[PDB]
Amino acid sequence: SVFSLKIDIADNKFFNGETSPLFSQSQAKLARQFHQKIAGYRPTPLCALDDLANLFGVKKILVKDESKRFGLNAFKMLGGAYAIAQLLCEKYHLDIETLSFMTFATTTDGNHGRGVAWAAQQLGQNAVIYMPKGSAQERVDAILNLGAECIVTDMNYDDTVRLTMQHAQQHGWEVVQDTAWEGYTKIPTWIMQGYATLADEAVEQMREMGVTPTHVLLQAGVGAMAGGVLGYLVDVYSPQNLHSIIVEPDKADCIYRSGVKGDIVIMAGLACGEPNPLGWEILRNCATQFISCQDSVAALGMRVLGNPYGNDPRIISGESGAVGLGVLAAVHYHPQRQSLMEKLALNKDAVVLVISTEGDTDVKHYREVVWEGKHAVA
Amino acid sequence: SVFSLKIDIADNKFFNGETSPLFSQSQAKLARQFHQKIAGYRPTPLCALDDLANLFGVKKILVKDESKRFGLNAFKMLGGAYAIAQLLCEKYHLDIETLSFEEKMTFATTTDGNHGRGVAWAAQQLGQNAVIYMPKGSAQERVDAILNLGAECIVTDMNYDDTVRLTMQHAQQHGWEVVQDTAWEGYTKIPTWIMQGYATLADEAVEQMREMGVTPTHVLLQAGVGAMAGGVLGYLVDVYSPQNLHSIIVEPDKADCIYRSGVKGDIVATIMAGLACGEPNPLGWEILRNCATQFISCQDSVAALGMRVLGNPYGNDPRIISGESGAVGLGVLAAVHYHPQRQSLMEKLALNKDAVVLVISTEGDTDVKHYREVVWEGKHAVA
Numbered sequence: 001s002v003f004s005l006k007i008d009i010a011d012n013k014f015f016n017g018e019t020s021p022l023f024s025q026s027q028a029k030l031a032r033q034f035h036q037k038i039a040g041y042r043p044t045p046l047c048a049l050d051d052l053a054n055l056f057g058v059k060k061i062l063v064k065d066e067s068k069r070f071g072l073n074a075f076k077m078l079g080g081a082y083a084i085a086q087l088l089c090e091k092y093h094l095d096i097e098t099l100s101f102m103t104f105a106t107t108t109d110g111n112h113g114r115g116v117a118w119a120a121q122q123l124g125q126n127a128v129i130y131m132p133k134g135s136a137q138e139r140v141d142a143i144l145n146l147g148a149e150c151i152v153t154d155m156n157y158d159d160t161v162r163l164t165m166q167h168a169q170q171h172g173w174e175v176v177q178d179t180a181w182e183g184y185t186k187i188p189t190w191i192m193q194g195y196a197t198l199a200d201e202a203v204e205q206m207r208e209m210g211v212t213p214t215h216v217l218l219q220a221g222v223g224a225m226a227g228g229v230l231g232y233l234v235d236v237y238s239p240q241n242l243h244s245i246i247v248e249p250d251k252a253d254c255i256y257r258s259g260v261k262g263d264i265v266i267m268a269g270l271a272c273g274e275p276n277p278l279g280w281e282i283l284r285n286c287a288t289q290f291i292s293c294q295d296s297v298a299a300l301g302m303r304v305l306g307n308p309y310g311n312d313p314r315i316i317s318g319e320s321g322a323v324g325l326g327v328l329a330a331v332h333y334h335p336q337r338q339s340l341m342e343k344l345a346l347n348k349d350a351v352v353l354v355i356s357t358e359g360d361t362d363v364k365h366y367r368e369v370v371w372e373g374k375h376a377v378a
Numbered sequence: 379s380v381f382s383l384k385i386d387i388a389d390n391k392f393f394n395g396e397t398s399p400l401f402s403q404s405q406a407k408l409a410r411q412f413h414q415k416i417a418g419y420r421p422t423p424l425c426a427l428d429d430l431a432n433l434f435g436v437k438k439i440l441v442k443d444e445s446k447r448f449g450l451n452a453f454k455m456l457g458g459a460y461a462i463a464q465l466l467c468e469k470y471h472l473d474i475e476t477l478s479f480e481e482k483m484t485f486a487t488t489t490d491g492n493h494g495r496g497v498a499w500a501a502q503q504l505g506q507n508a509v510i511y512m513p514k515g516s517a518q519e520r521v522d523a524i525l526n527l528g529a530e531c532i533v534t535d536m537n538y539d540d541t542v543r544l545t546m547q548h549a550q551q552h553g554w555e556v557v558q559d560t561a562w563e564g565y566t567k568i569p570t571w572i573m574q575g576y577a578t579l580a581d582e583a584v585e586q587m588r589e590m591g592v593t594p595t596h597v598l599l600q601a602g603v604g605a606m607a608g609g610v611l612g613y614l615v616d617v618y619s620p621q622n623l624h625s626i627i628v629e630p631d632k633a634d635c636i637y638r639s640g641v642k643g644d645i646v647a648t649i650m651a652g653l654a655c656g657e658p659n660p661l662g663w664e665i666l667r668n669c670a671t672q673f674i675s676c677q678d679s680v681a682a683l684g685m686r687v688l689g690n691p692y693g694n695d696p697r698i699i700s701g702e703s704g705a706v707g708l709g710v711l712a713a714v715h716y717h718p719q720r721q722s723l724m725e726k727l728a729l730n731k732d733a734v735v736l737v738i739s740t741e742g743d744t745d746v747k748h749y750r751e752v753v754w755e756g757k758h759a760v761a
């Protein structure tokens with residue numbers, strides 16, 4: 001069927017190609033050295049969707065399956081656990097190379113807090129995690145399952161973030177929040193560096209395949225992952241020879257609207273309000289294009305990934321996890337496919353990296369989308 | 379989420395447990411012995427959906443995956459190829475139990491997809507001709523499938539039943555051999571063999587369940603005219619008896635001929651192409667009237683739900699490619715599960731924690747276009 005989903009593409013006019021040594025090969029190698037020493041480490045699968053590539057008119061679609069990231073069903077773990085380890089290695093005067101085996105506070109709509117909760121349990125320390133209203137019970141239960149304190153509020157994530165701040169300064173907690181703001185940059189920097197492990201894995205995995213990625217699609221909420229992963233990839237592949245596309249939901253396209261203006265200006269995980277300044281700076285510098293897409297584009301991605309084409313490997317991907325792949329699928333069935341493919345420079349030679357950032361973190365919603373066809377194309 | 383799709387259940391008030399000797403274990407053995415002699419024969423997988431059965435509160439959900447049947451993506455050839463070989467054994471006075479390899483005959487049938495394909499393929503394999511007719515609105519991909527076997531295919535301006543009559547006429551006019559998977563006045567011999575040919579899948583399924591050490595308490599059988607249901611249930615009740623099998627006949631809302639025949643006790647467009655019905659198959663009807671426990675008339679979206687559930691399995695369950703007509707049996711189980719009145723519907727269907735439910739996935743993605751519209755785009759969604 002032919003259908004038109006909103007997929008607004010805008011060229012980054014503020015692109016300068018200025019890389020960030022702060023997020024590079026060397027730091028990601030230190031970040032990966034850390035994660036390698038964690039019990040049950042395994043590089044997550046880089047799945048080759050060959051038959052879907054041939055159907056879409058490109059050479060390779062390659063998906064980093066972050067649903068395999070230990071038992072957490074998401075990638076976020078990579079940042080939080082690294083920053084928590086760095087925070088202690090600073091406070092207790094140690095070297096990050098030795099990994100011998102008091103309270104961390106944060107707001108999350110799901111994955112980030114689970115990462116912080118898991119790391120706290122692993123290191124014997126405590127964790128208090130705040131969640132906004134409407135958040136799934138399964139996601140609350142998973143945080144309590146790790147032995148942390150989880151409180152569901154009555155206000156939105158941006159308002160809830162203030163509550164975590166006022167509580168942590170009044171009780172004595174250490175804020176391990178995945179976004180930066182004036183007077184708070186140290187931890188988010190480490191988080192973004194910790195994320196780069198997945199890009200480091202994917203690069204080693206791509207070299208083993210013997211391919212060179214021409215494109216990358218990165219979903220963005222506050223842009224911490226996009227920033228950290230893009231900054232690494234452009235350090236490896238150059239900002240000029242990697243066509244990076246940042247993907248945001250229609251109702252929370254802060255980074256898109258920021259790229260549109262120049263200055264700083266739905267699926268849980270990709271909600272924004274205010275963009276992460278550390279992330280923004282990298283995307284403003286090195287991101288090729290920004291996409292603002294409809295809600296149902298993510299839903300499509302989940303279905304395409306969960307029921308693959310031909311003989312491609314199946315991938316379990318959540319709403320925020322599947323939106324990059326969804327863009328490619330929405331472009332394929334769009335009447336303006338030709339001009340959309342040209343605008344994104346997607347052609348028979350395009351090798352496309354996609355990051356599946358989470359699995360079925362909310363089973364109820366996941367199965368409502370893929371079985372019931374909630375948020376259908378129609 | 380919680381949702382209500384139309385799933386009307388009717389007890390078969392005319393059940394009497396009279397089996398049919400024409401559809402038994404011995405005549406399924408002869409069928410399967412014939413199929414084993416054909417190149418590329420492999421029993422189709424019986425997939426255990428252990429995690430879905432857990433979710434649904436039953437013991438076992440086992441799906442016979444007929445998408446794997448001889449590269450044809452459907453089960454229908456099991457009958458077509460068997461009838462055709464039997465006809466050749468009448469024409470050349472040959473023994474079927476002995477022959478295997480190889481005047482020009484022409485085989486003619488109406489189909490809305492799979493039957494004709496099964497016929498066309500068999501004519502190709504035996505170096506004969508096939509002329510296949512198709513009702514208006516038939517998927518171009520299915521027209522192409524038949525042509526790609528070296529057979530003629532014509533898409534008429536008429537419905538299924540009228541196209542069948544045009545096939546009859548043209549066959550008399552040209553001297554063709556009509557190979558139709560339905561019966562009527564003066565035409566019962568071939569659709570008997572066709573029905574006997576289908577029992578091969580049930581024979582395999584019974585053997586496979588035995589290797590697993592299970593015994594089915596339930597079978598869900600989708601129906602168009604009821605040749606498959608009739609042929610398959612007829613064998614199954616010879617194995618397990620009509621009384622020990624809770625057999626449920628599944629039909630689409632817009633073409634529930636066997637359901638409507640069920641409530642009355644006499645012979646009386648859907649997204650489930652294959653399950654369309656104008657007039658029921660009287661040969662299949664006799665078996666269903668007799669041994670079918672219940673009939674289900676259901677909404678089109680029930681098949682769509684089944685398709686999605688099968689193609690994106692729960693937990694660690696095996697993935698199955700299942701088409702619109704192929705998935706509706708499973709779709710019933712999934713529709714009941716999410717229904718507000720789940721408990722009562724489960725009780726009605728006598729489904730509990732011990733139920734070993736056999737489901738027949740009768741075809742894979744025979745219409746790739748529609749299949750992906752269901753499973754990717756969410757066409758015919760619950761809401």
Ligand SMILES: C=C(/N=C/c1c(COP(=O)(O)O)cnc(C)c1O)C(=O)O
Nearest residue numbers: 109111112221222223224225269357358
């Ligand atoms: C805001 C959150 N979500 C982040 C997230 C994102 C967005 O990451 P950034 O906030 O770093 O853009 C993408 N994909 C998945 C699966 C995610 O969980 C959070 O975990 O609290």
Ligand SMILES: C=C(/N=C/c1c(COP(=O)(O)O)cnc(C)c1O)C(=O)O
Nearest residue numbers: 489490492493602603604605606652740
């Ligand atoms: C009418 C056709 N199909 C019937 C069919 C049926 C219904 O079988 P009966 O017509 O024997 O009821 C079930 N499943 C699939 C995949 C089918 O193709 C045909 O192949 O022409």
